[PDB]
Design a binder for this molecule. Structure first.
Ligand SMILES: [K+]
Ligand SMILES: [Mg+2]
Ligand SMILES: [Mg+2]
Ligand code: NA
Lengths: 260, 95, 198, 103, 153
RNA sequence: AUCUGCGCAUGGCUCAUUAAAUCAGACGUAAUCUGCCGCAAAAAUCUUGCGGCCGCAAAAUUGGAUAACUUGGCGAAACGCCAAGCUAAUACAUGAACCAACCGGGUGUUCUCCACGUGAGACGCCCAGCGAAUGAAUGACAGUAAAACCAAUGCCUUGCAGUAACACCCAGCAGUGUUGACUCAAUUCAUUCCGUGCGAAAGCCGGCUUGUU
């Protein structure tokens, strides 16, 4: 039972400077994994800049001023990972946690009737006592009666306010997916093929809007729409399009020159 | 006896101090439940039975959906079979 | 204390392992129950995680199942008659899994009479098969027309004691459940028991 | 609604293994019946001469006790003329199938 | 009148304790044809994954093996390795050799090495020394056995 | 102050041990345990107060402790100790009928029919919660076409077109868990669980509007 988390051992996506401290806020168990989460203290202090330090972050959080999935969280070690809707009603923040093309966490601003919607990737299906079909998603939710067509890998559209499923998107070829882990994290493409290896990891090959083919393990894909144009969730600024590094460097240099 | 106020008969001890004012100390009556506590206790059971009934209703909804889907498939299959059979019997009639 | 680690074992090459750590609680063992035939006596053991294992030191009754009839009855254990590990476990009347015992056949005889209307004792508190209503008589013939019993089992029921095999671990569960020997399993063990008497 | 105008009537429960056709008939006495069908689901279908008589039977026989059972009566949407037409259609098919067997 | 029970197979019953499969009851009077081979007996035989065919001897045999991947609770998982039979002197156990070449970086050259493995061989197979076998990883069956023979080539 | 709950198995330190060890990358655990934390679920349970087991009623008005404290203390001391008097808990123990469902298995020398029993229907009483144990059964199929006959049974009508299943009260209230694989998930039936399980903490705090819902 480990309670601490060194800053060097902390995930790089948290963007915590190595000289500021020795420790980082260890994520408490919960919805998302320790390596694939962004703690509420980090979100409220190092991202939103609302709190200048951990003390003010605690004063903000312990009042229940920050809502994650329509429920106030008083813990600064709450995981608060991917697809999570974080709303501050006092400031009316309402942003969703997504991945950008660089793989870092991004705060995509939402609106009403969009902050009520959350997508969940079904990671398991099992029958509970009373012969009740239960679907377990990527954030730890257990849906008590999902769509009869739900299968492992498909995504469900969840209404966080009403706590009910509103739609199901199957994991089929041609669907639009976002890569959730690995080297292609944050990229958005369409499934062109899924090589199935019984006993081993399946490999999904995807092609983005520009036509660049890239592969990844099938456990790292997350269906977000029926097509690369009709997405069921808003994505970050880059629209999941990885840019060539040389072209990006020249564009940044040109923009910096044009600023002055 | 029952239905009698207990707070009136509680032991009150007298504290006398130089100057100030005489102090009367009485214990906080534990296990004395007011009508508010009774309302809370009844509300607990009401909520439990409501939750169980709601779960039963959800089970009924799911079962009805499953059975309706099976019914629709069954009668589509039987309508197709009836069309095939009627085409077969048309040829049978009058050789 | 007792351990279940492979540190004390010699390597496949014959070498001696040089242990560089102290013993752990996650690799412990515990002394066996050595369950005997007697009036029920058990002791709880706090296993890992907070759960409990009922170490049974003595047991006298248990749930024995007629599998071909898909039924079970709680009967007394009369004897232990064969152990594959050694005959010392038969002399000491030790109840372990897969050991052969003799149990009370009266509940099984009574259930047979109540279910199929056949009284084994008659042809050679007790249920009366002539008292049954004639709706139950129609029930008995429907059941009787599919099912036939084995003579080896029927002979044991008439004698009053029937051989059985323990299917539960008494030192872990704390109970001695079992199954009645039927088919080739009964004929296998009966032959071993005849060798001892001659 | 397809039941108000119809002259067919559904009556439940009637347990065929415990009731005879004449025993159902004494309940259905007073109104002429073209035919009476009893089914395994413990219910019977009757077809009366007129929709007025069929309607008048329902409210007067709904809730009454028959053979010790509270009895429910409703207007049925099926029609005897439709049944007769379907049987007339099926008879020639039966004959054709019989001939096909010996062919 | 009386049910005629099956006889005891003297060629299989040699272990001083009755040898039986724990997944099925051979003493049922009216089996359900789910676990019934072509000979009419009651046999439990499951289909392991990864596209491995259940041997005909596993399906319609008489042997009893508590550690066979096809007729017991032993499951195949993890690595699927390939080797050559080296020794067949144990009972229901074989030694296989995995011969490979190891690249020594400094000299830019390879060297031949081998790795002996203790593998449990089900009675559904009869491998000889020098035969080529496929093995699948299972749970520890003894202090050295962690693999089960899945196919003889 | 002292009960109660939680932590103290982390952090810090050192590198003595240690070569089928440790460790690294890569894999398993379908061979397992897991407090905290996330999302869920929960219809077992005859209790209480009054009068004479019964009757009648019901916002269940549960019971013993025991610290701190006090009194008398012991000991050279001791992160040492007696003994007696108080007094609480979300400590400990106990215990909640009805409300309040669905669904099954076993039966009665039980009645009502129907035929002269695979009959039907009431009614009685014995069990039917989660988790656990043993035993049976599920946990699919997927390498062939036509008639007969008999018994029963549905229909059609008074011979088989046509026909999800099902002898009412539910005419679709699961014929369909999952995996690469399961003796697994879950379900049903039989018998069992003896503390070594299972309260609505018989708990606490707020609002208001201030409510035997
Ligand atoms: K304490
Ligand atoms: Mg001895
Ligand atoms: Mg440490
Ligand atoms: Na012996």
């Amino acid at each position: 039972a480990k309670k601490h988390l060194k800053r060097l051992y902390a995930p790089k996506d948290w963007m915590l400077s190595k000289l500021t401290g020795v420790f980082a806020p260890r994520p408490r168990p919960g919805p998302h994994k320790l390596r694939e989460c962004l703690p509420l203290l980090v979100i409220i202090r190092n991202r939103l800049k609302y709190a200048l330090n951990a003390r003010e972050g605690e004063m903000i959080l312990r009042q229940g001023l920050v809502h994650v999935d329509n429920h106030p969280r008083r813990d600064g070690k709450y995981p608060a990972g991917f697809m999570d809707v974080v709303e501050i009603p006092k400031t009316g923040d309402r942003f969703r946690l997504m991945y950008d093309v660089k793989g870092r966490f991004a705060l995509v601003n939402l609106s009403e009737a969009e902050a009520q919607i959350k997508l969940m990737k079904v990671v398991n299906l099992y029958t509970a006592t009373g012969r009740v079909p239960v679907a377990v998603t990527h954030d730890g939710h257990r849906i008590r009666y999902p769509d009869p067509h739900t299968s492992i890998g498909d995504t469900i559209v969840y209404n966080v306010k009403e706590k009910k499923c509103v739609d199901l998107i199957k994991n089929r070829q041609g669907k639009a997916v976002i890569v959730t882990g690995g080297a292609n994290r944050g990229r958005i493409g369409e499934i062109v093929k899924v090589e199935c290896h019984p006993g081993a990891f399946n490999i999904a090959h995807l092609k983005d809007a520009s036509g660049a083919e890239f592969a990844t393990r099938a456990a790292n894909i997350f269906v977000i729409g029926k097509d690369l144009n009709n997405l069921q969730v808003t994505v970050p600024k880059q629209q999941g399009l990885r840019m060539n590094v040389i072209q990006e460097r020249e564009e940044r240099l040109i923009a910096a020159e044009a600023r002055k | 006896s029952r239905t009698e106020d207990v707070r009136k008969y509680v032991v009150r001890r007298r504290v006398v101090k130089s100057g100030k004012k005489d102090r009367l100390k009485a214990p906080k009556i534990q296990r004395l439940i007011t009508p508010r506590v009774k309302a809370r206790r009844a509300k607990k059971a009401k909520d439990a039975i409501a939750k169980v009934r709601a779960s039963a209703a959800e089970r009924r909804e799911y079962l009805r959906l499953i059975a309706s889907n099976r019914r629709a498939l069954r009668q589509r299959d039987h309508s197709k079979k009836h069309t095939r059979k009627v085409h077969a019997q048309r040829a049978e009639v009058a050789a | 204390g007792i351990v279940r680690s492979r540190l004390h074992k010699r390597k496949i090459t014959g070498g001696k392992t040089k242990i560089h750590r102290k013993r752990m609680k996650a690799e412990l063992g515990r002394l066996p129950a050595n369950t005997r035939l007697g009036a029920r006596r058990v002791s709880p053991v706090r296993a890992r995680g907070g759960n409990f294992k009922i170490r049974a030191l003595r047991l006298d009754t248990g749930n024995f199942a007629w599998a071909s009839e898909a039924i079970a009855h709680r009967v007394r254990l009369l004897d232990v008659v064969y152990n594959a590990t050694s005959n010392e476990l038969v002399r000491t009347k030790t109840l372990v899994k897969n050991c052969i015992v003799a149990v009370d056949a009266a509940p099984f005889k009574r259930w047979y009479a109540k279910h199929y209307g056949i009284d084994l004792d008659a042809d050679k508190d007790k249920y009366d098969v002539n008292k049954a209503s004639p709706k139950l008589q129609r029930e008995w013939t429907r059941r009787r027309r599919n099912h036939r019993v084995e003579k080896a089992i029927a002979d044991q029921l008439r004698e009053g004691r029937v051989l059985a095999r323990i299917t539960s671990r008494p030192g872990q569960s704390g109970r001695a459940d079992g199954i009645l020997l039927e088919g080739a399993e009964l004929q296998f063990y009966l032959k071993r028991l005849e060798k001892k008497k001659k | 609604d397809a039941h108000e105008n119809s002259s067919c009537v559904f009556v439940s429960p009637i347990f065929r293994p415990s009731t005879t056709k004449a025993q159902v008939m004494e309940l259905f006495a007073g109104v002429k019946v073209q035919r009476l069908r009893m089914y395994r689901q413990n219910f019977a279908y009757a077809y009366l001469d007129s929709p007025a008589a069929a309607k008048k039977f329902v409210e007067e026989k709904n809730g009454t006790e028959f053979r010790g059972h509270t009895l429910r009566v409703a207007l049925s949407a099926r029609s005897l003329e439709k049944l007769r037409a379907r049987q007339e259609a099926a008879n020639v098919v039966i004959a054709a199938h019989r001939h096909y067997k010996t062919h | 009148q009386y049910y005629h029970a099956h006889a005891v197979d003297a060629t299989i019953q040699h272990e001083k304790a009755y040898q039986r499969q724990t997944a099925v009851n051979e003493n049922m009077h009216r089996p359900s044809r789910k676990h019934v081979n072509k000979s009419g007996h009651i046999r439990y035989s499951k289909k392991i994954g990864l596209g491995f065919k259940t041997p005909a001897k596993a399906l319609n045999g008489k042997y009893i093996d508590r550690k066979c991947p096809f007729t017991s609770n032993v499951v195949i998982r993890g690595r699927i390795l390939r080797g050559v039979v080296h020794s067949t002197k144990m009972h229901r156990t074989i030694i296989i050799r995995r011969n490979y070449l190891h690249f020594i970086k400094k000299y830019q050259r390879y060297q031949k090495r081998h790795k002996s493995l203790a593998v449990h061989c089900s009675p559904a197979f009869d491998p000889k020394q020098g035969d080529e076998v496929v093995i699948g990883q299972c749970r520890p069956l003894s202090k050295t056995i962690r693999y089960n023979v899945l196919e003889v080539v």
